[PDB]
C-alpha cells in the first residue's frame, strides 16, 4: 500500500502547474492525459472511501 | 545501393504473429469511412486468397524532427530514425492516429488506434525508432528494417495484440516490431503501376469491359 | 576482415544463419545470450 | 519497500518548494512508461490488477 | 551529431524573432567546433 501510494504521490507531483496548463502547453497537457490515463479516477475515489 | 524510404512513397505496415507454429504475416487496415478503427488483413496466404491491399496502403506526407514538429504545430525527404512521421490513408485521405478511445478488455491502459479526418494535432504523428542496435538515431530507414512506432501524445507503441484469440492492434506500452514496405515511390507520366482502378475499352473508347448491372439475373457474374 | 559483410548458410539445407528471436523475461533473466539457429528466412541483421 | 525508497527519492527530485519541475517530472514519466514494471504488478495492463 | 543538435537549436529559436546573449554564445561554440571538424576533414584529403 504504501509502495502505491508514494508511486501515485510521485505521479501526482510530476503533475503539471496550473499555469502551464492555461498557458496550453502541449507537454503539460500530454503528460496531464498520460497521468490520468494511468490512473483513472474511480479507483483514486474507492481508495479514499 | 540499398532503397531508403522517402515521402511521397505508399507502404504498408507488416507485423508478423506466430499462429499453430506457423509465421504469419499482416498488414495494417482501416477502411475509413463508416469505421475508423484499425485492423490486420493476412498477407501470407495471397496465392489461394487476395488480400484487400487498397485500404492497408499509406503514404508519407511529412517527416520532421520534434522540434520542428513543435514549432508547427505552435503556429522529397528521406526518412531518419529519431523523425516524426504523418501517415495518410491512400483510399480515405484521412490520417493515422491514435485515438482516446479503448474497447480493450485485456489492457486497461492501452488505446485504440484508427484513421482521423485531420492531421492537426499530435495523435496524428508517430516517431520511428530502431528495432536492433544495428541501426541507430539520424540514420536512414532502410527497406527490410524492423521499426518501432511511438505516438507522440499518447507515448505508446503500436502494438499488435494475440491476448485475445482475435488479433488485434491497438496503443500499448508494450512494442510490437513492424516494417514498412514500399508499394511505389515515383512514376513517370502514363507508365500504367499496379494497384490503380482504371478501365479496359475494346477499341475507339466505345466499348468497355463490365458486369452486369445490378438486379441482374446473371448474380453479377 | 572487419569491412565484408557475410551471411552464413548451410550449404545441403539452404538455410540461413540467424538468432533464435528470444522470448520476453530474457531481460530478467539478464542473459546477453541469444540461440543460434537456421531459419530459411532469417533477418536482415544476419550478417557478420 | 525498495520501490518505496527510490520513490520517495525520484519526489525529492521532481518536485521543490511546493512547485513541480517539469524538466525532472517529464523524464521520470517518460522513463517509468517505457520501464512499465515500476509502476508494479498492477497497473501492468495485460492480466493486470 | 553535430549537425543535428545546430538544426534543432535553429528551430527552437526559429519563431523567437531575436537570439538572445545566451543562444549566441552556444551558436558560436557549435560553428567554431565545427569550424575545426570542417578543417580537420579538409586535411585528410588535401594532397589529394
Known sequence: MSFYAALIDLLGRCAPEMHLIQAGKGEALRIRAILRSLVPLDDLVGIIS | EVQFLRTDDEVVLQCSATVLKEQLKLCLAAEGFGNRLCFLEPT?????????????????????????????????????????????????????????????????????????????????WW???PASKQRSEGEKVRVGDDLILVSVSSERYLHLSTASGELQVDASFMQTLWNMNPICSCCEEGYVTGGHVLRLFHGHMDECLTISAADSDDQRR | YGESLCFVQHVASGLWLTYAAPDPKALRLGVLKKKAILHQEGHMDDAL | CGG?????????????????????????????????????????????? | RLQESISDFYWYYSGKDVIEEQGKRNFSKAMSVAKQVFNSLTEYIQGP
Open chain 2, 127 to 129: 516517431t520511428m525508432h
Open chain 2, 44 to 124: 501470407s496466404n495471397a496465392q489461394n486468397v487476395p488480400p484487400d491491399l487498397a485500404i492497408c496502403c499509406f503514404t508519407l506526407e511529412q517527416s520532421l524532427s520534434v522540434r520542428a514538429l513543435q514549432e508547427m504545430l505552435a503556429n522529397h525527404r528521406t526518412l531518419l530514425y529519431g523523425h516524426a512521421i504523418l501517415l495518410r490513408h491512400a483510399h480515405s485521405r484521412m490520417y493515422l492516429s491514435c485515438l482516446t478511445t479503448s474497447r480493450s478488455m485485456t489492457d486497461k491502459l492501452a488505446f485504440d488506434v484508427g484513421l482521423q479526418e485531420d492531421a492537426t494535432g499530435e495523435a496524428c
Open chain 4, 4 to 49: 518505496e525508497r527510490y520513490l520517495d527519492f525520484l519526489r525529492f527530485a521532481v518536485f521543490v518548494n511546493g512547485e513541480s519541475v517539469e524538466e525532472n517530472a517529464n523524464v521520470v514519466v517518460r522513463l517509468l512508461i517505457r520501464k512499465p514494471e515500476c509502476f508494479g504488478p498492477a497497473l501492468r495492463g495485460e492480466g493486470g490488477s
